[PDB]
A paper describes a structure:
Bacteriophage [name] infects the human pathogen Shigella flexneri. Here, we report multiple high-resolution structures of the full [name] particle, including symmetric and asymmetric reconstructions of the virion capsid, empty capsid, portal region, tail, and baseplate. [name] virions have a spherical icosahedral capsid of 820 Å in diameter, which is connected to a long, contractile tail that is approximately 1205 Å long and an average of 235 Å in diameter, expanding to 315 Å at the baseplate. Overall, phage [name] appears to share some similarities to other model phages, but in different combinations: both λ- and T4-like decoration proteins, HK97-like capsid and portal proteins, T4/Mu-like tail fibers, a Mu-like baseplate, and a P2-like tail needle.
We determined the structure of the [name] neck or portal region next, with the map resolved to 3.4 Å resolution. In addition to the [name] gp29, two sets of whiskers are seen between the capsid and tail. One set of whiskers points “up” toward the capsid, while the other set points “down” towards the tail. Each set of whiskers is made of four protein chains: two of gp30 and two of gp31, though one chain of gp30 threads through both up and down whiskers. The connecting copy of gp30 may be involved in maintaining the up/down conformation, though how this would occur is unclear. Each whisker is attached to the neck by adapter protein gp37, which binds to a gp30 dimer. A key component of the neck is the dodecameric portal complex. The [name] portal is structurally most similar to that of HK97 and Agrobacterium phage Milano.
Author numbering:
A (entry chain B): 17 to 177, 195 to 454
B (entry chain C): 101 to 133
C (entry chain A): 123 to 177, 195 to 454
D (entry chain D): 101 to 132
């Protein structure tokens, strides 16, 4: 069946996919730390992280069968078990957000056993059911080798080099832009190397240039006789005074000079001069506009132009809105990707190990980054229900009320009418 | 000037100098100065 | 993407499943790498020969993998990558940019230059002259534009030639660069973005366009994405869906196709305006279809009549 | 000019000298 294979480089276990030496696991870890230093890159990959940490997660039954009691009770188990972990769900996401800087984030799952105080990894609930605790965790600088599997097809296993070699099904791995099915995927920093390298060096040339701009520096020209140790005390005293003049001259009120002046009859030129050093040219390239071009290019690579341009009146970060921003949709792709890793990973492991073995599974979802524009929503419904179309439903009356920030109304207590005039 | 990566290191050890805010080849090295 | 089928067989197999029906399926690759395919095998008159190896051998048959071509016009398996019609501006831009970086690097205007008589430079020179050269070296390597910046230089206008021998000055250029590289690079970048029709990346989201295919203001890039999606849909339909439909038996004439939704929902206000202005007069007849389409435009699913909204909890 | 720190400190000991507002280095010094 599998007549082919995903042979990327297969050099020595280490993935030699990227032809650039600097951007490979032994050194790519070195480079990404460097690239994170620039504010333009740092802010670009920090706005994305903020969005993920902002959304919430809730376990729900599948697309259909939301009415089933057995499924609905399973969600209550999972939602409670999500917060049971010793590190909050949000904290796990923060550890996951190492995603952007490296392109992948391993997380060795650790399963607490029979719920019940007990010990090992203590936990609330005592329904003697399996659960999660501790790592996740993990860092990208520890993983040395990725173990293969015969023909290199479907080999998701790696060590953590003392060494703590882990098997394939023990951890979750998140792929940013998995293209050839390589474990490391592709960090978003990969397609921003060229602007960054150009931007940093030209910035560095500018700073050095300002420091070495000696135009206007005071220059004192003395005859060689003055400069020395065997010179007469009067001459040596003169040189000492010039040293203080150089070291202490400012542009205060009493600024001025009384210098000796002697135009030599020979050569028709003066011997002593106090002059300000002058340059007879201008710098070729305008460094100011040069850096600005690269900064926009870096933000273009991460599609984070909102950082520079700012929030517009026709762009929005709301996923459900009809005018989602380019950057806002990018986090959606990232958000969906985590949901896809959920397929084989923890929930399936939790489900299968605990037995049950049901065809339908329980899936995790995400909410919107920001609430959609109510005014468009408000104009929509109010002006389209009086004509027909919309059929009023509990779902409609709940989503609309939840947009404000409320919860589905209890019909048990209504609003009074005696006051309503 | 500074060409020989060598002379620069020897001149980088002399205690009697000035701590420059930034010099060439600074932002590509982790262990900054 | 070589299709690798699968049979549930009550799990306990090479490719485990979760639905116990003993039906054929798919797993694993797809996948596959473009840089591995060495040679493409033809078929006599070259008509309809989609087969290649993956370098006994590892040659794959024509009907075992799916081919997704970009702009197939002459039936070439490789199709035509969009980078092809953007090669030239890219090369121009990269060249000019490298030249600009090199030029910035070698912008030696304003560097200190010290002019010493030749006798100073040497090894047999008097120890004082060696100390002089050493201090000049320290000045060159250490001098900055701090607040005590200054200089006390020896100077002597030689009676002959009427020129000074010790010469401290800043190197100066007497010309300017012929071409303005920045504008050129910006022009080439604009051309590159034009090639992929991704102007929205630089210009930004304009009020005369949108990313909704179903909208009447669909952007050009969105239309290209639509073309790509249609190509993917057609390839999927004629390929693996058909293979699964046939091989697994059944053998029904009519096949099931895959469909895709819209990238972004259309302008809600415009849809509302259209419906309001066309239904209150008649024209469009209200049915279940509109009532679910608009409600899913909101983001919901067809209303459950089993649970309508109360009347008490209202006006 | 300012090419020797030891010279720099030695010249700072002189009491009969003007006091400048801002000096090189007074941006990364904890105690000004």
């Amino acid at each position: 069946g599998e007549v082919g294979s995903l042979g990327l480089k297969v050099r020595s276990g280490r993935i030699y996919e990227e032809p650039r030496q600097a951007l490979r696991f032994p050194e790519s870890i070195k480079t990404f730390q460097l690239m994170m230093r620039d504010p333009s890159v740092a802010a670009s990959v920090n706005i994305i992280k903020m969005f993920v940490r902002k959304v919430n997660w809730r376990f729900v039954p599948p697309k259909g069968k939301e009415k089933d009691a057995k499924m609905i009770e399973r969600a209550n188990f999972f939602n409670s078990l999500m917060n049971d972990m010793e590190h909050d769900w949000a904290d796990f996401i923060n550890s996951v957000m190492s995603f952007c800087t490296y392109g992948f984030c391993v997380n060795e799952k650790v399963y607490k056993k029979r719920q019940g105080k007990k010990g090992k990894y203590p936990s609330k609930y005592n329904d003697g059911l399996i659960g999660w605790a501790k790592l996740p965790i993990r860092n990208q600088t520890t993983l040395d080798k990725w173990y293969f599997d015969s023909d290199y097809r479907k080999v998701i296993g790696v060590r953590q080099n003392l060494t703590r070699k882990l098997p394939r099904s023990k951890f979750l791995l998140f792929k940013y832009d998995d293209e050839y099915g390589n474990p490391e995927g592709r960090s978003p920093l990969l397609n921003a190397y060229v602007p960054w390298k150009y931007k940093v060096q030209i910035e560095e040339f500018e700073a050095v240039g300002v420091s070495r701009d000696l135009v206007g520096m005071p220059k004192i020209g003395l005859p060689p006789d003055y400069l020395g140790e065997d010179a007469e005390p009067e001459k040596k005293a003169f040189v000492k005074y010039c040293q203080e003049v150089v070291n202490d001259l400012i542009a205060n009120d009493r600024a001025g000079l009384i210098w000796p002046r002697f135009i030599d009859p020979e050569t028709k030129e003066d011997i002593f001069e106090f002059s300000l050093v002058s340059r007879q040219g201008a710098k070729a390239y305008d460094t100011g506009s040069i850096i600005d071009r690269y900064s926009k290019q870096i933000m273009m690579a991460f599609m984070s132009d909102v950082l520079a341009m700012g929030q517009s009146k026709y762009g929005s970060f709301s996923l459900a809105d009809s005018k989602t921003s380019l950057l806002a949709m990018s986090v959606d792709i990232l958000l969906k990707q985590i949901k896809n890793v959920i397929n084989r990973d923890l929930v399936a492991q939790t489900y299968a190990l605990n037995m049950w073995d049901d065809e339908e599974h329980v899936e995790i979802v995400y909410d919107d980054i920001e609430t959609p524009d109510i005014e468009s929503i408000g104009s929509y419904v109010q002006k389209t229900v009086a004509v027909g179309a919309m059929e009023v439903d509990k779902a409609l009356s709940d989503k609309l009320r939840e947009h404000i920030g409320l919860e589905p109304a209890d019909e048990s207590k209504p609003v009074s009418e005696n006051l309503s005039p | 000037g500074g060409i020989n990566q060598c002379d620069i290191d020897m001149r980088r050890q002399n205690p009697c100098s000035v701590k420059k805010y930034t010099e060439y080849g600074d932002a590509v090295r982790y262990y900054g100065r």
